[PDB]
Amino acid sequence: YSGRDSLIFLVDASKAMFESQSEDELTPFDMSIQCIQSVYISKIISSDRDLLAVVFYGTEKDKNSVNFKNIYVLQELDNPGAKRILELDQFKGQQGQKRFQDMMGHGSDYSLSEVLWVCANLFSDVQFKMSHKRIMLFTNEDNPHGNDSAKASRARTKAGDLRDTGIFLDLMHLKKPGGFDISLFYRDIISIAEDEDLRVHFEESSKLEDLLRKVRAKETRKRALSRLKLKLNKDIVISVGIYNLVQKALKPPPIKLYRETNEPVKTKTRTFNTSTGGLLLPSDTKRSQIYGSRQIILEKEETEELKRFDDPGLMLMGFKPLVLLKKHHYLRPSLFVYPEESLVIGSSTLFSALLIKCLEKEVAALCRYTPRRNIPPYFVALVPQEEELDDQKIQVTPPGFQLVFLPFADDKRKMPFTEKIMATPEQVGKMKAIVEKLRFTYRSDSFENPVLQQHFRNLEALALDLMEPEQAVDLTLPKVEAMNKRLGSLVDEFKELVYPPDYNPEG
Template structure:
């Protein structure tokens, strides 16, 4: 497999040529000269072409591939790159980028043949000079023996350049006080991957359906304009009518800005107070001159004094403000003076009080849970766990695109391995349950609802009736007062008699 499977030996040329005459893709004289076979011509792949590759799966597919395409052991990787260069040169239109994706499981295709390895490295440099780059998809090994000379990462690129190429999430004012304001960009470095939202399609034409809302007069059926409608709210016995502009102003909490309130020591920021991923703040010089200088001075002072700035962060007009901490981040360089970490402020979101409430636990319960956690510790890597919802969504799309009967079921890697955990922990789980739960605890029993504590006396209800504020009470609160059957019968009897 790998590039070895794409090469034809001289003894197999006649048989391969006969098989190629029957296939829809014929080899060009250039390909025959350097003995490289192409499964398909350069074009956008269709479902039919992708399904055609299924015949090369497994051991039987490997034999089919060797018989159809040929194989050999004295191939040259530089010839493969020459074929790729020729495919790009035949393109008549302008391309945004040119990239070759190398799928292989052979880490050292040329072995000890340094001549062929040097030729491949030279050819790869030539392709990079004309704007053709490489991506290595190592199927088994890491490609360090041979492909480290083929796949070269640019040393000129830095973390700062990568950051500035990103689109900022927002551009805000950093108000140090009433008179000093600088401009900063907010970057979102970590984003949760979500499934795209569903799109409604028209059944006959399969076109997207656009939803349109219109307001009509219930009496005349005439169409109402936005200026003809108003919002109202009943407060007490009064109906408050609001214009559309007034309703929008109610949602406006503050001007979008980042406003420091106080400086605190860095040790006061706890790691377990983590409501969501942080953002990154960097100065923007184009709007306010001198923003970079003042931002750098603030960063240096926070680094020297080991403090954080507690700020009120308002991203948009109609979004409530957040309380965040600006944590200073120092610039880091490697041995070659290349920037590894960009200087700036990490914008860390702070939790509200309900998030930081402490769970009441005895020392015995805490010690037992610490022992359980120590037993279940593992080396965590984020790339070892895939989102099962997204993976199944991608497989459903693949099944729909390739006209498959059933989609492939994704393996849920985040499910706990209960059997292995029970073997490791032994009786520790039952011991912890005995410490936490009572003897009569039933996990499958029904949950009893907690009773409300907001009970009102008869005098308080009379006061609300006289003021006309009885409408502020919710339905459940009203029902709690009229729980007795006899009282309900008296009210109904009096109502129908009147």
């Protein structure tokens, strides 16, 4: 865990945010609010347990507790909800903006120091462990608070103060026809870990394209599967963390709730004497398995100890070259092992030495693995995956041992096999050409389950109670027309090459 995330959005309640160079372009307030909607939807599906708030500045009215003028808070730091989405969308649009300007003011003098006070106080309100005091704001101009030198000085003083307090903030470039005026008033006063300010950005060219994009995932935090241990012989033991860099996600379980109250009704379940109508007890339980006629009775710890073979841990078997593993031999999704000094101190040194040595030897680690108590231990192989970096020196692959599992004899399922049949080499060349026609470079993040996407689409659609639900796009459908036009007549050429001209492959 080690902290949580929270963002607060700041919108200039002025008239510059309520115009457009051309009607094809929305107002700054318009694309800001729609990007806010997209961000909130993403947070709900991704990390709904975070904190989000909305505050406005420059408006005529105000709502902050300290009651600084022009400082109207809209929403406080809370887990996002569809109600907030509705509150935002009631003013999102070419007329909802007018509704907002009617029921709410816009355009007045203020001090950025005041909004910084308000946001700092809002930070003070939250109490859970917190890690990312990210602040987001939206405008296309900087100099209005540089107009008053005293206002500029106090604003930059408070900005330095909040930077000292660990607060991090980010601004979106908005389309100002005369240029946002980078480097004039903000990047010297705002918090940046890097400098790319080169163009005063007459347009809104910054990272809205990423933010408006909707993501659909869960992004489970880095949680150690176990600090399980490797028993070398009987006493040489090291502490290593267990991880799964891939973990099959699935649709969240439903919650059974009422009809007219919609309340999730608790469901107590028990067992009673059917022959009597009385009541039975968990102690009054006996499991049976009848093979033919004889009935055999087993109990709780009776069924437990049959699963008992050894203590949960890793028991080294030996070493074998990596090549001696058949690729088609697969059991289930692989695991990953990372060292740790939390329990066994110096175990990281041993892990590094083993990784380097076995990488030199090109050998695999054979070991007996017991996940937890009362489980049959299974043999596994630890292939050393070296940490690989990129042009950005980011870990495209972390260091450690990828944990692949070794199937047993029962796993092997033989099938009715046939003889070996060969093919003419010219047909093989035709296949090579046809493959080259439709070849491409695979990338892992280029594909996704459309079924869960459609599930989400429906979920937020009924949440947003529109006329129609959003339609997900299947990225797993082949481009049949594109592939066919890309191949040409080679398809039918090989069809007559191999398949009989009179007999189609269809029966």
